[PDB]
Symmetry: C2
Subunit: 770 residues, 2 copies
């Protein structure tokens, strides 16, 4: 039947309609594949979701007729996450082999034969799915490329598809300090020659020669991205954890979103914004119905749980008006929903707690007739066999790591090894930086004051540093529990903000437009700045650019990437982007420093000492591509000496705050992490949300910080830190105590999240030791 569009004949859908032809191409379903896990904390660790390794689990095939069941995975100690191929005669999954090798991606046919190992990766791998690019019809396809030059066929490749999966390295911590950080990877199954078929060059990334496969990382988020799936328009639907800093009451949120299979254009779908339903509930295992086009997902009571109730929001219009509750009146737990083109669904359901496979009933808003339920197994992840129609494959302008593809001749190129760049780079542009749907408020993701065109002088670009602490004696979690951070603090910072550094600064045009070139394949976010160089509004999220890629946005959280059409805007920055035919991008790279006038106003942007094979492929000087020399503000190395020199003299235990004591660690509740000055400055204030700030300090807002208010001796923002600020008796002007560099160093420190240890891993600077 036709769904999205009309067909050539009444009763039949056009070939451009995915959900319409998945109807017809499906075919009868006699058989189903599903995962059986032992019932144990460690047998079914859904509480650790996305990081899920149901040790001792098997993937099994059950036919709905004779009702036989066969175990395909018997060679594996652990097996889970079944995903069927297009024809339905084979599937891919995640497993731990009895011979070892860790938890990796595997694939085998439906009969149990043809076992092949996809991933040798060091880390954990799960959630494989088939996204076929350049492969529609079954067969072989041609590899063509260019050498004055021509386009020649160099021979062929079997066209099967690509594998999109979630994976995480080891010795890594997320923003919740869990010992995993997941992300999305695209995998060439032919050894990189499918990418070479599409792009004209083999996939760049981590290579697995012995397995004849290649992997590339399409999502750089510092927290876990997981459960990838297919959108009707041919993109990747998945779940993303945004924990960044104090965002969303400090507990962050798990959103359903989509991204291109090369990770070129990630955008939110539902759950990440204020006003939206579900709060801190976890959203996982999201799939889309064919008939009514609804995104159906598991809504877990707890953020990290993989089981819960069933929620739905229309894919066409993902808003609160289309939200609905599919379950919850039987008090049972649901997981792993699987919509069918027949407008049926297979759900894993535990009424009183024994999980089994059941047909879903939409009329009863609950689980229907039983398929297969073993009392000795949690039966979940149903994956029925049938012919799946194939989503559209979008053109990729990246060959993967360090590799871009020209927009002119479409020729793959390596920015590092060949062109001589220190690191792969890309661009981004905002048409209006003063344009927002956010009001003026105390919270860092809001405006600290009204800003018009010309009010925003420049922008700060910050790169998130992953938290890696191999030595457990040099790192402790919850050392700042008495401070603003709470349980999300650590030996590194007294706030919820983890270690990060400055990518660099970029000026803003008078109309509020800005554009810049910067590092790629790295997590980053940005802050709009006033004439004093302080952040008015902070973007709390993790953005990433693929090599040579660039990204546009209408405004600052204006909704252009969420719920609203692009506003038509003619911007100055557009003419600063690429004007030269011999260049990839003519847009300026992020500047390292700032220059101010005598009054402390913003004079402009200043170059650093990192300037750079290299080729002539850009007009502007190359700055900030060296990861080694990237600058950050560390409290011990930078701020503390300033405090000792210009402050601690008049500030002791008798004159709060107490800045004395130097770098000597102060024991709090049996934990010695930071010094006296840090503990003093990060101290909470009664009646104030610590997610906003403390007495003297507001993380990621300098303009809202009482300390900065006093250092500039003025009221900087529309949010007052407290009722009485400037004493009417015995007041002392603090504005002349510091130079501009020191004061703005403090400003930068606060805007960075006011950390303590900003240098990843154990270093020589004072800190937690046992």
């Amino acid at each position: 039947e036709p769904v999205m569009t009309g067909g050539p004949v009444q009763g039949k859908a056009l070939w451009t309609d995915y959900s319409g032809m998945s109807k017809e191409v499906q075919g009868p379903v006699s058989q189903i594949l599903f995962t059986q896990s032992p019932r144990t904390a460690k047998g079914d660790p859904y509480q650790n979701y996305p990081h899920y390794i149901p040790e001792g689990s098997r993937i099994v095939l059950f036919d709905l007729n004779t009702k036989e069941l066969k175990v395909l995975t018997n060679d594996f100690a652990t097996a889970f996450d079944p995903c069927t191929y297009w024809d339905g005669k084979k599937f891919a999954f995640a497993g731990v082999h009895k011979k070892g090798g860790g938890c990796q991606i595997w694939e085998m046919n439906i009969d149990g034969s043809g076992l092949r190992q996809m991933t040798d990766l060091k880390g954990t791998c799960r959630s494989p799915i088939y996204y076929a690019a350049g492969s529609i019809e079954e067969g072989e396809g041609r590899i063509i490329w260019r050498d004055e030059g021509d386009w020649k066929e160099h021979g062929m490749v079997e066209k099967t598809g690509m594998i999109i999966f979630s994976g995480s390295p080891e010795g890594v911590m997320d923003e919740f300090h869990n010992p995993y950080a997941y992300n999305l990877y695209r995998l060439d199954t032919q050894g990189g020659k499918i990418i070479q078929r599409i792009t004209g060059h083999v996939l760049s990334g981590i290579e697995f020669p012995h397995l004849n496969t290649t992997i590339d990382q399409i999502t750089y988020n510092l927290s876990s991205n997981f459960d990838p799936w297919l959108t009707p328009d041919g993109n990747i639907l998945f779940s993303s954890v945004q924990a960044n800093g104090s965002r969303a009451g400090g507990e962050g949120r798990v959103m359903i979103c989509v991204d291109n299979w090369d990770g070129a254009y990630p955008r939110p779908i539902y759950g990440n914004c204020d006003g939206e339903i579900g709060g801190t509930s976890g959203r996982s295992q999201a799939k889309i119905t064919f008939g009514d086009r609804k995104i159906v997902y598991v809504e877990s009571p707890y953020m990290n749980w993989g089981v819960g109730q069933l929620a739905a929001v229309s894919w066409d219009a993902p808003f609160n008006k289309t939200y609905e509750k599919l379950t919850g009146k039987d008090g049972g737990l649901y997981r792993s929903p699987y919509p069918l083109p027949d407008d049926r669904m297979l759900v894993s359901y535990a009424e009183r707690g024994d999980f089994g496979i059941y047909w879903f009933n939409f009329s009863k808003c609950a689980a229907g007739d039983k398929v297969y339920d073993d009392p000795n197994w949690n039966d979940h992840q149903p994956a029925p066999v049938y012919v799946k129609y194939k989503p559209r494959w979008i053109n990729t302008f990246t060959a993967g790591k360090n590799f871009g593809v020209t927009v002119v001749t479409y020729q793959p190129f390596d920015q590092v090894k060949v062109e001589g760049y220190p690191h792969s780079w890309g661009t981004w542009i905002c048409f209006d930086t003063t344009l927002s749907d956010q009001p003026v408020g105390p919270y860092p993701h809001q405006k600290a004051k009204n800003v018009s065109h010309g009010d925003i002088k420049a922008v700060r670009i910050i790169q998130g540093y992953q938290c890696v602490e191999p030595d457990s004696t040099r790192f402790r979690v919850g050392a700042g529990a008495h401070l603003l951070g709470g349980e999300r603090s650590s030996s590194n910072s007294g706030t919820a903000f983890q270690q990060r550094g400055i990518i660099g600064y970029q000026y803003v045009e008078s109309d509020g437009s800005t554009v810049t070139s910067q590092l790629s394949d790295v997590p980053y976010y940005m802050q709009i700045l006033d004439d004093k160089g302080m952040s008015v509004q902070t973007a709390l999220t993790w953005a990433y650019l693929r090599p040579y890629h660039g990204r546009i946005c209408s405004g600052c959280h204006y909704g252009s990437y969420r719920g609203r059409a692009f506003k038509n805007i003619h911007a100055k920055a557009l003419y600063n982007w690429w004007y030269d035919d011999r260049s990839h991008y003519d847009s300026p790279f992020a500047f390292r420093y700032l220059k101010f006038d005598n009054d402390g106003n913003y004079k402009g942007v200043k170059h650093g000492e990192d300037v750079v094979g290299p080729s002539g492929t850009t007009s502007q000087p190359v700055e900030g591509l060296t990861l080694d020399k990237q600058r950050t503000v560390d409290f011990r190395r930078d701020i503390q000496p300033i405090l000792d020199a210009k402050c601690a003299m008049c500030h002791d235990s008798n004159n709060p705050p107490n800045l004395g004591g130097g770098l000597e660690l102060v024991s709090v509740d049996g934990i010695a992490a930071y010094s006296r000055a840090y503990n003093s400055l990060l101290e909470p204030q009664r009646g104030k949300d610590p997610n906003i700030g403390g007495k003297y300090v507001n993380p990621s807002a300098a303009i809202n910080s009482l300390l900065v208010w006093r250092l500039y001796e003025a009221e900087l923002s529309a949010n007052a830190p407290r009722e009485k600020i400037f004493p009417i008796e015995g007041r002392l002007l603090h504005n002349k105590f510091l130079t501009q560099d020191e004061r703005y160093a403090i400003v930068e420190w606060i805007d960075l999240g006011a950390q303590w240890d900003n240098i990843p891993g154990p270093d020589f600077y004072p800190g937690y030791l046992v």
Copy 2:
């Protein structure tokens, strides 16, 4: 061991120390009682909590040693909620017998003999506990009273079994979530009223069960469910209360841990109901207190109506955020029904994957410890270990139950209705400062619409809530106002989350901000402070109740005097207006029916009604339930709109007030008129709980409509960015008289309902 205080000897505790004496009197634990439930949605309906009737369940006795189990409940169709007596040789529970009779309260010896039915009620009964009042020691107490101007003499004696506090719901009622149950706490005389007669000198007033030789009295009048009562160290009742009132708590509501006296004289919050606290909308149930470190331990469910979930704890001595802990506390499963022992051990009902069992708790590993007993075919919960319980101190009661007070002078019981001649039970309350609050200036109804000082608050509006009762199923529909502000909690009666209400009356406020008044007793109520225009500046969202003859004091308006702070020392004018006369119970003025204003509509004074009827020196007013005034949109507002508004307001000139009382179909539901739908319409970028375009429920002063009717800026909260148009402006202040305008004001402050008359009536409404 000494806990709260030092004892007579080192290592031993004073008898005044409840925790310590509980430690010393406990003894070794051998046998335990617990509930086994069938595993089904119908067999274990913990999603319907507080309303829980695990049909098919049984109560069993298990030996921790010989490991042999026995079913004591075999004669019952369903049994649950076991609670052991002080000696531990008998226990009380809830359930329905095979002979029928419904779900009731029973008690039985733990050997399985001596069954007795403590309750025969129309409704459902749950979670009985023993509260020993007048009985510390085993034996017979003597009954003594005054001879009606004679001496005090002894009449008879009574076996002292104490009393029984339980939670129960009537038949055919709806809560504020439109669930078909409303739970409240009841005290029960085990001896048939003569325990109360021993304490008071008159038998317990309330519903009598002469066949069971028992009597019950309702101690909590909250419109939503109060459930799972327990014992505090200081001798009060600890339980969970549902505060759903109106649009409060983001239109959701909260389940709070709170305490009250066994007669319900002094309800106060412990933890969970206030902004800035932890757990949000999480359900809080089955709370108990640890003996050693004195910590309240409760089940925190992710869903408000769920009875299973995690385990959290807060200090009893200091119930604040700083003392909040999450006991369990990670992987992988669910917890329910914790039971802290005096020896600091604990029994929890734990499900690792899917099925609950009895487990010792491990505080070091923050999870379930060694296994006690689990059947795979049963869900094993509600552990009730057998040991000796130390009796908490019993507090003096000044009420004999319904209509009955007890004087503070001679201490003799008196009936306010049958004898003294009052139409209804009446208590008093006093606030020393109505301008004193911990709340900031904000758009939400529980906050201040504007800054107010002494003298700025002229009077107060006292509002009685009406239980939602709809016998006819054809004339009532839930979710009729889904397109309006109410959302899912709306109905045929209201387009808001506010259910049906009425005005108890107005009371003036002294220049120092103090106020005192006499009003109805044993009815749910709350109040609003009013400015010189008679509009609510701040609304108290909760259900207060007064027992007969009982006064209730508070320092301020949500100031912390009843929550987190000490009473503020205040010398108030209202204090002298309370009781000055020898011949009177209370000399405080009753709530006035109306308010009278000046020419422009500013507050002049309070005006008596026609409901005015020698134990008080003031006119008795507002004690007649049938005469209680409310504001109905159809009867009161809509006519005014038709006469003075609908004229030039049509589809072309929004809002559209035309069409009269004719119903409008929205999403296939015909509930309200055109004017109601128009005025209750939501606004983009505005929290529906705050209000809509023209109407903010329970704030008139924040409403755009009222802003235009007075043609002025009323509050510090702007309804929208552009209020008054620049061109084409027309002044609306002269269109209405003060009566009509303030009628609209009253309508909005009441929650802006549609049907304010409970049950099916003759006025237009939903019909199918």
